[PDB]
């Protein structure tokens, strides 16, 4: 018969792209984004980054209205928050101000972030490819965020950020720096590995 | 006020004991015109001056001070339904209560407190069926009444 009618076209194309993702031989610059932080390092990174979440619109408005109401009747330290926005973070990286840069691995126009690991390594800025662009937006109060960064940290968490940077250097940089520059995606299916690898 | 029930227990002060439920008895006493001095209300962190009655539920009483009238709860339950302050002799601590009948009577009209076939041929089919249903219903009612009467007689045998 014609059983294809059990999938709409968008579902079928959506799964065909998934198959093509693992069957095609992807170049190293696009292949490196499959190597991300593991469970423990990613869980520890988001514990530090969730303590410097920027104020939402409502909280900032309330804080400003309290000051306004105080003034209407009759010396603060610099704030701390996670830096986001692609242009802002890229400008921070090339000025050597970012202490740690998280790069999402699922940016749909992937060319928006392909240069970012190379720029971070060239400029001597610690970086980590983190699985999930929607998870970087939670600590930014946006639906998605391509990147996130930490420029300044409170003196209580200075040791934690250094330890996290060392952990990422040992687990992510020094571990993948040889396989990062190899073509990926040459996964063979069973019906194909049975007839090529065996024969 | 407009009813005798609202005037009962007017010049009465009841001493509600611990055994009797205060929730369902203070409401009944107050709704008639009485006053309640609950015994269960002196357990937190009076001395019974004007009390004229006492509702008890123990098998045996202890004090029995003169002047007061000692009653079982059913007296109140029977003083409201009649509305005429029935005698308290039958409601005393330690004896058997009267059978406390329902204010709305019995389902089949049985009173507990008490001492054609040739013409049917011409009936139609549906009329005959209706008549037989009615006779069956009446017979079942009378049989249910007679069973209760027989059980009462057997109980009164011993």
């Amino acid at each position: 018969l014609s059983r294809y009618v059990k999938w709409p076209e968008y579902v079928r194309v959506q799964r065909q792209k998934k198959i093509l993702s693992i069957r095609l031989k992807v170049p190293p610059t696009i292949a490196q984004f499959q190597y991300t932080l593991d469970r423990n390092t990613a869980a520890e990174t988001f514990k530090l980054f969730n303590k410097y979440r920027p104020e939402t619109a409502a909280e900032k408005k309330e804080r400003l209205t309290k000051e306004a109401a105080a003034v209407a009747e009759g010396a603060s330290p610099k704030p701390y928050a996670v830096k986001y926005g692609l242009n802002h973070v890229v400008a921070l990286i090339e000025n050597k101000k970012a202490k740690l840069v998280l790069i999402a691995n699922d940016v749909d126009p992937i060319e928006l972030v392909v240069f970012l690991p190379a720029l971070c390594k060239k400029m001597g800025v610690p970086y980590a490819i983190v699985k999930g662009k929607a998870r970087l937006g939670t600590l930014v109060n946006q639906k998605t965020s391509a990147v996130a960064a930490l420029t300044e940290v409170r003196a209580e968490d200075e040791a934690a950020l250094a330890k996290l940077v060392s952990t990422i250097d040992a687990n992510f940089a020094d571990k993948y720096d040889e396989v990062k520059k190899h073509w990926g995606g040459g996964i063979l299916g069973n019906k194909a590995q049975a007839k090529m690898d065996k024969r | 006020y407009d009813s005798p029930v609202a005037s009962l227990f007017s010049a009465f002060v009841f001493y509600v004991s611990r055994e009797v439920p205060i929730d369902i008895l203070e409401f009944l006493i107050l709704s008639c015109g009485g006053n309640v001095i609950s015994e269960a209300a002196m357990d937190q962190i009076i001395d019974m001056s004007k009390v004229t009655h006492q509702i008890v539920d123990r098998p045996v009483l202890k004090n029995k001070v003169a002047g007061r009238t000692y009653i079982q709860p059913q007296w109140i339950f029977d003083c409201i339904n009649k509305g005429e302050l029935v005698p308290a002799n039958k409601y005393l601590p330690g004896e058997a209560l009267p059978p406390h009948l329902s204010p709305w009577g019995d389902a089949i009209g049985y009173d507990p407190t008490a001492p054609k076939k040739l013409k049917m041929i011409m009936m139609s089919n549906k009329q005959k069926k209706l008549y037989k249903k009615m006779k069956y219903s009446n017979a079942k009612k009378e049989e249910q009444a007679e069973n209760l009467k027989k059980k009462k007689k057997q109980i009164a045998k011993q």
Partner: protein, 87 residues
């Protein structure tokens, strides 16, 4: 002082009162611990209670204000700590 009839049964106590020329009969269970069966669906009883609570709120306001009483009645916190009933 509107109570007209009372009947103590094995299920609870039936009270019949005279509210505005109508006979109102309600059942109050005995104050004993309850055994809740898992069979019943409280999802329906909660909606029924939600409707009935508002019905009583309005009816009680009307009844209190027709008789000149103040509504809602003031709760005596000192007498509520001993018995906590109608008194």
């Amino acid at each position: 002082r509107l109570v007209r009839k009372v009947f103590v049964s094995i299920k609870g106590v039936y009270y019949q009162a005279n509210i505005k020329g109508e006979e109102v009969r309600w059942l109050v269970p005995f104050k004993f611990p309850e055994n809740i069966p898992s069979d019943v669906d409280f999802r329906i009883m909660l909606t029924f209670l939600e409707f009935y609570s508002t019905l009583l709120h309005f009816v009680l306001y009307k009844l209190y204000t027709d008789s000149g009483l103040i509504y809602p009645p003031k709760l005596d916190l000192k007498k509520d700590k001993i018995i906590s009933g109608l008194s």
